Structure formats: structure tokens, C-alpha cells
Design the sequence.
DNA sequence: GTTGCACGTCGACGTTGAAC
DNA sequence: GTTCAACGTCGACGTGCAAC
């Protein structure tokens, strides 16, 4: 997506919505509906698309409450009808606008609007793109609260990139939201396919209708997602209304949802929106996020794969969280964990991570237990530049992680520890089991692996793993290899050095490395004794 | 070899095993009046530990409330820790002299068994950075921005013999006292400086003084307003959209830069094209600087002075305001005058915090009252003031190293206090052996060699 | 106007609204409409009140979108009809609720609700009161933004108290909002009247219909206000729908509004809601608040009186603000100004004041200029306890101000400076023109008066008058009267004292007041020389 | 050239009570 | 009894550009 002049133009319109009573979160939804009707008229074909009596002119001509009421009426009429194509967009649609004066102003304003962000031919796509971008701004905005849906663009790109969705594969998004992941996935497939040109017609139909699926609780959000896909040319299933279905993941809808080869999603954090957990799970839990995880495991086909953005919350949480986690490692093969930096999301405080795992194992797709042997972790979070408007989070930041990650989507590719990006070396190291019996160089590396048994024993089955410490200090770096190996040891060894310096002054020894080594040989040994 | 190099004498044990009881506390129903009403027993919150040792209790918690609440009564001479409020992981500790008290969820009481472990010993132990490093291993934590009591119990710490623990703790306590002493002198010096500020500006060196509009002043001095002496300018900002402006080569100094201090250069700068079209004001060196937005602590002012060789010059944003001295004035002298609190008092009285706030009007600055001393006198005064500030800086440095010293000692003591050798005194018939600075060291060396030799008899001596 | 168990009960219902898409600000509006319908049914008389086909059962029975759509339809139907009584409540009414699931839940929830906060007989009043109280909470809440309307309860009480509205007098509120002031004013009148029993029937009708008037821009807000008055038994004008009219003060409606004897209002701060200033004024200004002030001056009858809450912005602001300010003093007699403390309003940062003035003068009600001779100011703001949930702002704080204020509504009562409440003495005095040539005792006083000429000259016609500092310091207090008189002088005189102490030590003089005076006699004189 | 904010936006320290 | 937070509470430090 991209936006510029048009988004600014769109932004101005939102002012009416703001004054209207519409929330920031619902600006896009409000705008999208009106634009759709407007565009239909612009097509000239609108008779085909819209029913008679309910069209742009009908709405446009009206004013005041009379107009507002008409708008409501129009929304209801559109939402319900055999013409599911249009009806899906309109399904469960309603306007938040209370102030009648605002509606009149808004309709007229956009009515006069140009194709200003356009291109040769109608740039329907531009509007949708601009629409998403504007939505992104709202998502970014803290006040709106829209941000819950918000996900970093580069994050999505990377996730799909690693997954490498192929054609004929079904991609699912339990928390579709705007359908950010689905669109990206589709884009990825097309980029490979030459826009599906490479594929046969049958496969092409599959990708268009069947390939991607999503579910959204909020009807308002669903509308936006539907429009997004529509411009994206993702028709989906007409019966359902399109690619994104309206329903509760946690409820009956979720179970009804079809199984999928690949799953990429960012579930909501916190208690979440009104979503009752009517559905039973292996381990029942109040944790909404945990509930999603169980769902993801269930839907995946044997040997399926998925990446899930999760709050840090899931990693250690005791009680059922421990049980579920254990369940995850047993049923799935959790190969990689990515620790995200902070400031990336609309919400500031939240710590987030990305989990990578496979359903069962490649060798044994139907392996119930002991799937997860080793886990790799990447510490993107500590000692990182503060992100913000000033410091944007970009694709470049992610690139090092992806490299170590390996081309294999399963994560099977060869891997070795030893990543020192973002001034990894400079960063301080923590003392513990994590960096226990660890060499100096390794301790600094962002990329490290851990054994299942270790996690079980030391971690006590806690995913919250990290070696590094967030600081900033300067100290001369002359130490023995064994000294560096033990983080804890450093304090004791260092003390010895202080005394040595005093003696050296009296001696008047020159400042040379060799001299230091000679002294260290005797002094160092003494400490060992 | 274990958590760290550990001596023969010591063993590594978890706090849980060593500690008799570790538990949290909880919070009562605030809504009910009865719980709080007329209560004997003290209640503690997180803030309590932070403020000094825990002698006093901010809130009061009734036992009726106690029965209903999970909160429990803690014993005296008990160590306490705070779950929340840290650099993600660290943790806090405290001791309670006052009779048994209660707390809430964040706090976790811990009781040491009699003679098993000292409260003092543990307190310092936790304080150690090594302790912090160990914890940092968990990380910021995923879903936890606190310290879980369960995790607390897991912690492993080395244990000294009872005798040494007392001796070791004693040594550390003493250092702590020393740092405080330096702090006291530090505070006093600004007080002295403050007096000079008031006396010098108003009093001046003279001896004959007369009544003046602005307080009693010397006879020689003369009075004038700011506008007379200097000129005020206002300034505007460019439009971010145009990238052309983005090219630069010429400095722009924002308030943030002002916060930094003396300002030769600025983080951001604007292009000449910008100055032409924008018609920004250019500034020469030696010019005065003032802060129009932010305010400061409410309605107050800030100042600064520009520097330049023939080579460079500076321009600033709207937020900053500039003043130029016509012919006669000493920029440094004036700058100090503005910062003086006397000015602050005059200014604040004239305008209390009002809607126009966190900023100063041009009118206010111009109307400002000022004295005009002679050029020579002005220079003399300025030199004196600047000099005093330097002294304050030096003392601060002294404190820092002292802190470093503690760090070094603690590290050594951790390993060594941990060896049995520490409990035992060095073998010596006479106390004189230790008395000499050199002699004591020599005695230590001899003892070490002899002890090792004797130890040689059995591997177990060294081995265990 | 209190709430307790019921408000908590109502609060729970709001949860549906929250999840529904309704804003915090619009919780009350949503609840109020439903409750009204419900109550009508409870009456059993509903056939009289509501039209057939549109009633509680009709709405109650429906579910889902079908229900939601019914609700919108019902709202429209009610709002428009000859039956203005009901129609006024419903006028420009609309529901913010997007989520169909929420509506069903909400209707059913309240449907099952009890008279729980009630009394012998239907406690319709209780619901309204609880309603306002709940509204107050929202007003208090920062997130809602409802707080813009919010005003301190004790503040309103005091304002009406000072005004002392009488019967047959017309009270107006340009920014009626919930009609907090109007209800208070009505209450005040009734308290005097024995609930209007004392008054004759004609007068009684006057009070009910004619006595109070208000105007509200937002239809949503107006609805709430209307309901408030309704429970309050303030019928107002049926043509208009009731006491509170719907319209723009700044627009044609404002001018159309009738003249009033008394005006008490708290206009909105900031740019305000969408309110275009279609109306011309003596001094046209972008300042919304300034615009209101001009309106108030205009509507007032000669010899009228009013109190207005205003931000500090108005006092100091130059440009047109100076012109308007001057205009105010010329046309009106501005006797008193009250400086409010902070933390009282929903918004933290805002600084507010209360202006008291009369239209023209009592002696000459039609006096165009030079009306305002002297102005009294009360510094309630500085050196005050931080208010908050923990530290509530109560009536007691206000009592000292009212006492000095004087019983006379015009403010004519005798007045003298000299108020030292809230540790006024302890407060730090600052050095400036206001405390110029002021004695020590007077400087500390919160209650002080200023001349018009002084304001003109020193202040340069700026209302922002302030004598005190906010600090906290301890110093021995031994000073000469003239020393204290000059705030600026203090620094110089104090310096002399420092040296004196040193000499005293050598002398070994005892610590006695007389000794200090003797030394001061010589030392003090020297400084004067 | 320059003025104004029921301000607009950004670090420090610890939740507290509903839930089980 | 006690556990947990796309955190809750207390500030800290300054708008910046549309408007005239
Ligand atoms: C962080 S957003 C997903 C953003 C998405 N990755 C994107 O590209 O925009 C999480 C979404 O989960 C949805 N959600 C919350 N609870 C749900 C539930 N029980 N069932 C289905 N979706 C739910 C929310 O409405 C929200 O849109
Ligand atoms: C602070 S509130 C008044 C609160 C009132 N004192 C009470 O008791 O609740 C200010 C009110 O002014 C209204 N308002 C804003 N602009 C207006 C305009 N142009 N005309 C009429 N009312 C307006 C707002 O909608 C708001 O309710």
C-alpha cells in the first residue's frame, strides 16, 4: 500500500466524521461505503451493480435527517439481498454518524472530489490503497484504538516471505481484520506466478476463490477487509460474501472454518473485543490469545505450518499457559521464535514475539508428541534503536533475521549460532543458565539455540528466554577466555585487576599487551587457587 | 565452579532452602470503610520501601480487614522485596525495624532462619550487581514486568559461615556511610553560590548606595529597560513538505538545543534558499538567546549565548527568541542576570501561571527591568560567577569514583568472603604484624603459603 | 443528583454499549432512550405516551439486525410527529450502536432490570438522577472527552447561589449542555418558593414553561438535557420541544434566542465542536469563547447580571481579545473575578476563572461606557491542595470566597481586602506591580481589588492579574514593615542580615527580640543611606 | 514577519482489584 | 490466600503551523 495527496484529501473528509460522532476507528468504514457508491456511479454501470432506488444520486440528493435516515435505510437494503456480491460488502453495515449536519456536508464534500489520486483508467485500486493507508494512520494512532488491528507492514512482508505460500495451498487468518496477511500472501503467490498467468485456469480460479480465507468478528472490520480484497481481486466465496467471513473464531464459526495448509495471523492482545469462548478446547483457558493458539493448532493440516504474532504474554504464563505450551511443543514442532523490538506497534508498552512451528513433523506429519526438539531464538528487541515516527521500523531491520532463518519454510535449513547485528557485541550480557558455560563471543550473539530438555529443566517449560541486558557502559576489555565464559565470574576476576594496576604503577611497566599477559599469568592463576 | 568461582568453604544453596518463609501479600476491599477505619496495624505499599528504611507506614490497615484479606503480619527484622517497579527485572529490598506489619501483593516477605543466615548479609548480597546480572538472564520478560515470587525462590546464593557473614556485612555498611558524607558538602556549595548571586548583582562593589526603583542599589549604577539596551526578534519555521528546504548548510537552533546548553551548533539546520524565501532572521555571534515555548517550570525564562568565529553563524526557530546588544554590554553578565532568581520572582509575580503559560511574551521581556553597571565592573562580576560553577563539577566526580571503589571491593569480598580464610584471621602471634601497612600484607602472604603447604597434605583440603 | 448501586448497575449496561461501538460519551444517551421506553411500559399508560406499533414490547421482542433496524426506525418515527412532547425527546435522536449482537444483549439486560434504585412509588427521578451521575462519571473520564461539558457541582451551586435567581426572571444558558445550571437555578427558586407553592398559579406556569431556557448544538446532548429537565419537571416550551432548544448559539439560533435577565453558563473551551460562527458581532473574532461573551452581553437586559466560566485565555489574550475585553468593561460593570484552582475539571491542564458582571450599571442600566470602575479578584488557585479523586473539591473550599463576595447579587455589598484562607499567609509572595507598594500582610491576601486605571496602565487592559507564587520554603520572618512592603526590596535587605549574624556571634548577644531590634535600628538605617 | 493552545506529545514507577 | 496487565498512575517539556 501507499498513500499521499489522496490520503490527505481523504483525511480532511474524516473531519466531518469526527464532528459527526463517528469514531476515529470507524472513519475508514464510513468513507469506504460512500466512496463505493460514488464510484459505482462513476462507472456509469451502477445500474448493474446497485439496485434501483438505492444509488449515489438517491443518497446525494437528500439532505439533513431526511438524508441520514435514507442513508440508514439504504444500508439495510443493500446488506440484505440475493445479490450476495454486493450484499457482502453491505452485510452488517451501519453508519456511526449521529449528526445530520455532518452527513450532508460529508456527502457533498466527497461528491465534488476528484480522481485526484488516480492514473490512466479509473484508479479504483488507488482509492482502496489510499484507504488502507489512511486506515493505517488510524491504526497507528493511539487515541483511535484502531491500532489493535494494526501490524507492522514489514513484519507482514517478512512473515509471508518466510512462509512462502504456494498455490493450491489454503491460507487462513483467524483474525483477518483488514486481511493484511491474506493480501500479502496473495501478492506473494502472484509475484511467483506471473499473476497466476503461469497457472492453469482451474488453479487460477482456486487461488481467486478458494486460496485465501479469513474470519472477522466485527462486521465493521469485515466490511473494510472485504473491500480491501475486492480491490485486490480476491473474490473468495460468494456464499460467505467473499474471502473474509463474518463470525467468531472462538465460537462455532471458528470450528466450522475449514482446515488450512498455512496460517499467518496476529491475534488481538488483551482480553480482546466481545468474543465469548463458546468453543471447547484441549485446555480450556480464559486467555483469549491462548485460545487462538489452540485453534491454530487444530485447523492446521498435518505437516502444516504457521507463524503467529503473539504477545510476550504467551511465552511464560503459568497455570494452563504452561499446559498449553507443553501441548504446543508436543503436537507441533516449534523451531523458531522471534523477539520483536518495541515501539513498532501502535501500542507502546507491549512486548511481542513471532512463533514459527510446524504441525507435527515433516518426517512424521502425524506425530502427536515430542515434536519440538530444539528452539532457535533471535533477540531483535534488546539494545535497539528507539523506533517511532522519527525512527521508522523498516525491512532492513528484519533482513538479518531472515538470513539466519534459512530459506526452508519448515525451518529445516542448516543453522548455526553467531549473529552480532545492531551492535550486538557492544551490548551487555546477562548472567545465568542462559549464558551459563557460554563463551564471551557467543553470549553477545543475538542468534542462539536452546534444547528442549534445557527449556524444560532450567526454564521449566518457559518460552521467555533471553541472554542480554539493556545498558550502555564502557570498560576496558581485557579478560581471559574462561573469565568471559562465566558471566558471574567476571565480577570476581575484575576485582583482582584493580589491585594489579596499582602495583604496575610502582613498577613503571610500559603499556603493552605482552606485559599485561605476563602479569595476568601469575595473578590469574592465584585467583583460581 | 558453579554459579561462579566459589571457594572451598562455601556451598551453593537456594534462598528457599535457607529461608524459612517466603510469601506475598494482597489488597483489601477499598470500598468498605470499616476495613480502614480506626486502625492500629500498619500497612505498606511499594512507595514505602523506596523512601529510606522502613521506619514508617503511610496507610493503616485494620485487623478485621486483615482477617478478610490475604495480607499477613510480618515479623520484625525481616527482609522485604518489591515485585514491580524496576528496570524490568531488578527488584528492591528493605528491612523493617518497626513491629510486625502487613503489605500487599507486590511486597514479598522473607524470613531467615536463626543463625542460618543473616538478614544484613542477604540484603547486601541481593544488592550486588552479580545478583542483578543473574536475574537479567530472565530478560525483560514476556508477559511479566515484575518479579515472580516463585522465580525469587529459585535463586541460588552462596553461603558463608555465620561468623564471616557478620564480619563481611559490617565492612560494606561502612562504605555506605562515607558516600553520604561527601553528599552533604556538595549540597552546601550551591547554597553559598546562591547567596553570591543575590548579593553581587544587587549590591555590586561600591559602598555608597541610594534608594532605587528596583530595590536599594549602588549610587554609581544606572537603571534602564531591556528594550533600550537590546532588540528583540521573532522567528518562523519552514514547511516540512518541501525537500528543497531540507538541504542545508546553515544552522537552526531549537529550544531542545537550548536545553542542552551552550550552543555552537544544532541538530537540525535549514537551507539558504529557505532563509531567503522564508525570510528567517540570521544571528551573529555573541548574541543572547532566550526561550519563547515550553516555558519551563511554568512562567520562567531561560537564556543562552551564541558562539562563532568569522566562519559560522546561527539561525533559530519560532520557539526561540533573540536579542542584540547595541554598543555597550557584556553578554555573559546579562545572561547570568536573566537566570537569576530575582528575575524569576519579578516575572512570576507580574504574571502568575495563566492560560498564556509555558511561554513568555515579547512584551514581557522588553518591559523587563535591568540595571546597567559599567563595562569594567560587568566583566569582573561575570568572571567570578563562572568560576564558582567549575568547583561544583569537580566534587561530583569525586563521588563517582568512590562508588566505583565499592563495586570493586564488593566483587572481591564476594569471592573471598566466601572463602573460609576470611572467617579466620591471619595467623600471627602479635597484632603488630598486621599493624604495619606493608607488614600486614607480608603476614598475609606468609600465612597463605604456609596454609597451602599444610593443605597439600591432603587433596581434600584444597578439593572440598 | 446522586447515584450508588443503581449507577453501578447502569454502568454494567454501558459495557454492551462500549462493545457495541457506542462511545463513552454517548453511553448515557443510548441508555436514556431505552430506559424511557421501558419506563413508559412500566407505567402501563404507555399507550398514552407512545404511539402504537412503536413501543417497548415492539423493540424488546425483536432481535439481531432485525431488532437494530427496528430501533433505528423507531427512533425516526418518534422524533417526527405532531406530538412534540415526546417528539422533542426523540428529536435528532439516533443510536451509535453498530453491533447488532450488542443491542440484543443490552435491551434484554435492562429489560430484566429492577426498580432497584427506587422508592415508594415509581422513582423515575432516581433513574434520571442516577443517569446524570453516571453521566458525570463519563464527564469526569478523560478518555470519553465528555468532560468538555463537565462542570464542578459545587461550582454550579455557588454560581447560582451568588446570582440568587428570582421568580419571573428569565435564566438563559447559551451552552446548556445537560442543563446543569438551569436545573440548579430552578432548584434554587423552588427552595425559596416552597416549590412554587408560595407563588400564584400564573407565576408557577411562568416558572415551569418560561422561566428557564437553554440552547444545545448537539442533538445528542440536547436529548439528555431534555430528559434531565423532564424528570426535573421543567417542561419549557412545547413548540421548541421543551426547555432546551436545539440550535447553534453562534448561528442564527443564538440571535433568535430571547433576552434574559440572568445568564449562567460554562461555554466550551478550545476551538469547540463544529460550530460555525455565522453570526456577526461587535468585534468579530475566531475565538469561540470570546464569541460567547459577546453573545452574553447582547442577550442580557439592561441591568442584567451573569456569571461566566472562562479560561485564562480570555483574560490575557491580545488582538481582538483586548478590544472585546475593553468592550466588556465599557458596556458591563465587571465587579468580580474568581480564579479557580486546577484539577477540578475533567481536563487537567486547563485554567479557569469565573467572571461576575452586570449589564451596564445598577444606577444606569443603560450605561454604554465606563461601567467597570473597580475589580475584585480572589486567588483560589495558588497554593492549593492538589485535587483529584483522592482530594475532592467541595463546597467548603468555595465558602470563603462567597463570604467576601457579599450577599448582593450585583456585588454592590461592602467589601474590604484581607482574606487569608488556605494558608494564604504561608504562601510565597512574588515581586511585581500588583504587589507594588503593598504591605506585607496585604500581599499575602487572596482577596484584593484593583482599579480600572491600574489595569489599563499596568496591566494594559489585561485581566490576568496575579500577586502570588507557588513555592514552599522556610525562612525566619524578621523584617521591617517597609522591607516587607517592597517585595523586590527584600532581597537587598536580607543580604544585610547575613553579615549581622556573624557579628552577633562574636558579641555573644543573647537571643532576644529586643536585641535584634536594637541592632536593626542601626544596621537598617545604614542600608537606607 | 509573528502569534496561540477544556493544549499535543513524550520519560519515570510502579498497577489493584476482579478473578480463581 | 494470591495472581496479572496490544498495562495504570504521575508526571516532563515543550507545540508548529494555520491564521492573520
Ligand atoms: C491485531 S488485529 C489483526 C491485524 C491484521 N494482521 C492486519 O493485517 O491488519 C486482531 C484482530 O482480531 C480480531 N478478533 C478479536 N477477537 C476475535 C475473535 N474472537 N474471533 C475472530 N476475530 C477476533 C479483531 O477484531 C482484530 O481485527
Ligand atoms: C462545558 S459544557 C456546559 C456544561 C454545563 N455547564 C453542565 O452543567 O453540564 C459546554 C457546552 O457548550 C456546547 N457548545 C459548543 N459550541 C456551541 C455552540 N456554537 N452553540 C451552542 N452550544 C455550544 C457544547 O456542546 C457543550 O455541551
Sequence:
Amino acid at each position: 500500500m501507499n498513500n499521499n495527496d489522496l490520503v490527505a484529501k481523504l483525511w480532511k473528509l474524516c473531519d466531518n466524521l469526527r464532528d459527526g460522532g463517528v469514531s476515529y476507528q470507524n472513519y475508514v468504514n464510513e468513507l469506504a461505503s460512500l466512496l463505493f457508491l460514488k464510484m459505482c456511479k462513476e462507472t456509469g454501470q451502477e445500474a448493474e451493480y446497485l439496485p434501483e432506488g438505492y444509488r449515489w444520486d438517491d443518497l446525494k440528493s437528500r439532505i439533513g435527517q431526511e438524508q441520514l435516515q435514507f442513508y440508514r435505510k439504504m444500508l439495510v437494503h443493500l446488506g440484505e439481498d440475493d445479490k450476495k456480491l454486493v450484499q457482502a460488502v453491505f452485510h452488517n453495515v451501519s453508519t456511526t454518524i449521529t449528526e445530520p449536519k455532518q452527513i450532508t456536508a460529508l456527502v457533498s464534500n466527497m461528491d465534488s472530489l476528484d480522481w485526484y489520486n488516480g492514473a490512466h483508467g479509473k484508479s479504483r485500486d488507488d482509492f482502496g490503497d489510499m484507504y488502507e493507508g489512511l486506515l493505517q494512520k488510524n491504526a497507528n494512532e493511539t487515541k483511535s484504538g484502531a491500532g489493535q488491528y494494526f501490524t507492522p507492514r514489514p513484519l507482514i512482508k517478512t512473515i509471508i516471505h518466510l512462509l512462502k505460500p504456494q498455490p493450491r495451498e489454503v491460507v487462513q487468518d483467524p483474525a483477518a481484520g483488514t486481511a493484511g496477511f491474506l493480501i500479502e500472501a496473495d501478492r506473494y503467490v502472484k509475484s511467483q506466478t506471473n499473476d497466476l498467468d503461469d497457472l492453469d485456469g482451474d488453479t487460477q480460479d482456486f487461488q481467486i476463490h478458494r486460496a485465501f480465507i479469513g474470519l472477522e468478528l466485527v462486521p465493521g472490520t469485515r466490511r473494510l477487509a472485504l473491500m480491501n480484497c475486492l480491490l485486490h481481486d480476491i473474490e473468495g466465496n460468494l456464499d460467505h460474501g467473499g474471502a473474509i467471513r463474518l463470525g467468531n473464531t472462538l465460537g462455532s464459526d471458528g470450528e466450522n472454518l475449514p482446515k488450512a495448509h498455512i496460517v499467518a495471523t496476529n491475534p488481538p492482545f488483551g482480553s480482546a473485543a466481545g468474543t465469548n469462548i463458546t468453543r471447547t478446547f484441549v485446555h480450556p483457558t480464559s486467555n483469549k490469545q491462548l485460545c487462538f493458539m489452540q485453534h491454530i493448532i487444530e485447523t492446521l493440516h498435518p505437516g502444516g505450518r504457521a507463524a503467529v504474532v503473539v504477545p510476550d504474554n504467551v511465552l511464560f504464563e503459568g497455570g494452563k499457559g504452561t499446559d498449553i505450551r507443553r501441548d504446543l511443543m508436543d503436537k507441533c514442532h516449534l523451531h523458531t521464535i522471534l523477539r520483536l523490538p518495541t515501539g513498532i506497534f501502535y501500542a507502546q508498552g507491549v512486548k511481542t514475539n513471532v512463533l514459527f512451528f510446524t504441525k507435527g513433523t515433516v518426517a512424521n506429519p502425524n506425530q502427536d508428541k515430542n515434536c519440538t526438539d530444539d528452539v532457535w531464538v533471535y533477540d531483535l528487541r534488546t539494545n535497539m534503536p528507539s523506533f517511532g515516527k522519527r525512527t521508522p521500523f523498516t525491512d532492513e531491520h528484519l533482513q538479518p533475521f531472515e538470513r539466519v532463518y534459512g530459506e526452508d519454510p519448515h525451518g529445516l535449513s542448516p543453522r548455526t549460532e553467531g549473529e552480532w547485528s545492531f551492535n550486538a557485541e557492544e551490548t551487555e550480557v546477562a548472567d545465568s543458565e542462559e549464558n551459563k558455560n557460554t563463551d564471551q563471543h557467543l553470549a553477545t550473539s543475538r542468534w542462539r539455540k536452546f534444547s528442549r530438555e534445557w527449556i524444560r529443566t532450567a526454564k521449566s517449560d518457559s518460552l521467555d528466554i533471553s541472554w542480554l541486558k539493556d545498558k550502555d557502559s564502557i570498560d576496558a576489555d581485557s579478560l581471559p577466555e574462561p573469565d568471559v565464559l562465566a558471566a558471574e565470574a567476571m565480577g570476581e576476576l575484575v576485582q583482582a585487576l584493580s589491585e594489579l594496576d596499582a602495583l604496575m604503577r610502582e613498577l613503571g611497566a610500559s603499556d603493552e599487551a605482552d606485559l599485561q599477559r605476563q602479569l595476568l599469568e601469575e595473578a590469574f592463576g592465584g585467583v583460581k587457587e | 565452579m558453579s554459579a561462579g568461582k566459589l571457594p572451598e568453604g562455601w556451598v551453593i544453596a537456594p534462598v528457599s532452602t535457607v529461608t524459612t518463609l517466603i510469601r506475598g501479600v494482597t489488597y483489601k476491599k477499598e470500598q468498605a470503610i470499616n476495613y480502614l477505619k480506626d486502625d492500629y496495624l500498619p500497612l505498606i505499599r511499594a512507595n514505602n520501601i523506596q523512601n529510606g528504611k522502613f521506619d514508617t507506614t503511610d496507610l493503616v490497615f485494620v485487623p478485621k480487614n486483615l482477617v478478610k484479606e490475604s495480607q499477613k503480619i510480618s515479623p520484625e527484622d525481616i527482609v522485604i522485596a518489591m515485585s514491580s517497579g524496576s528496570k524490568s527485572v531488578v527488584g528492591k529490598s528493605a528491612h523493617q525495624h518497626l513491629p510486625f506489619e502487613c503489605s500487599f501483593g507486590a511486597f514479598c516477605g522473607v524470613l531467615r532462619p536463626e543463625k542460618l543466615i543473616f538478614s544484613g548479609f542477604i540484603a547486601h548480597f541481593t544488592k550486588s550487581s552479580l545478583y542483578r546480572n543473574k536475574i537479567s538472564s530472565l530478560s525483560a520478560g514476556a508477559n511479566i514486568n515484575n518479579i515472580k515470587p516463585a522465580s525469587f525462590d529459585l535463586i541460588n546464593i552462596p553461603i558463608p559461615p555465620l561468623a564471616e557473614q557478620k564480619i563481611i556485612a559490617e565492612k560494606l555498611d561502612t562504605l555506605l556511610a562515607q558516600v553520604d558524607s561527601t553528599k552533604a558538602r556538595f549540597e552546601q556549595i550551591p547554597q553559598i553560590l546562591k547567596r553570591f548571586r543575590q548579593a553581587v548583582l544587587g549590591g555590586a562593589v561600591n559602598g555608597k548606595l541610594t534608594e532605587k526603583w528596583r530595590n536599594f542599589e549602588p549610587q554609581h549604577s544606572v537603571f534602564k529597560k531591556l528594550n533600550f539596551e537590546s532588540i528583540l526578534t521573532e522567528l518562523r519555521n519552514g514547511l516540512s513538505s518541501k525537500p528543497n528546504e531540507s538541504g542545508v548548510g546553515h544552522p537552526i537552533l531549537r529550544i531542545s538545543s537550548v536545553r542542552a546548553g551552550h550552543v555552537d551548533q544544532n541538530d537540525i539546520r535549514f537551507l539558504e534558499c529557505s532563509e531567503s524565501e522564508l525570510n528567517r532572521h540570521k544571528l551573529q555571534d555573541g548574541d543572547l538567546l532566550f526561550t519563547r515555548y515550553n516555558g519551563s517550570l511554568e512562567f520562567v525564562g531561560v537564556c543562552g549565548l551564541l558562539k562563532k568565529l568569522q566562519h559560522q553563524n546561527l539561525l533559530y526557530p519560532d520557539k526561540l527568541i533573540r536579542a542584540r546588544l547595541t554598543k555597550d554590554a557584556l553578554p555573559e553578565y546579562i545572561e547570568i542576570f536573566f537566570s537569576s532568581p530575582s528575575a524569576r520572582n519579578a516575572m512570576m509575580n507580574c504574571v502568575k501561571t495563566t492560560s498564556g503559560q509555558k511561554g513568555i511574551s515579547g512584551k514581557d521581556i522588553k518591559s523587563q527591568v535591568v540595571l546597567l553597571p559599567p563595562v569594567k565592573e560587568q566583566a569582573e562580576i561575570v568572571r567570578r560567577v563562572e568560576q564558582l560553577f567549575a568547583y561544583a563539577d569537580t566534587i561530583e566526580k569525586q563521588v563517582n569514583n568512590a562508588l566505583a571503589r565499592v563495586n570493586n571491593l564488593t566483587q572481591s569480598i564476594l569471592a573471598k568472603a566466601f572463602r573460609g580464610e576470611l572467617t579466620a584471621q591471619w595467623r600471627a602471634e602479635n597484632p603488630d604484624l598486621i599493624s604495619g601497612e606493608n607488614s600486614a600484607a607480608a603476614l598475609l602472604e606468609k600465612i597463605k603459603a604456609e596454609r597451602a603447604a599444610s593443605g597439600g597434605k591432603k587433596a581434600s583440603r584444597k578439593k572440598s
Q: What stands out?
A: Residues 332 and 360 of chain A are 5 Å apart (CA to CA).
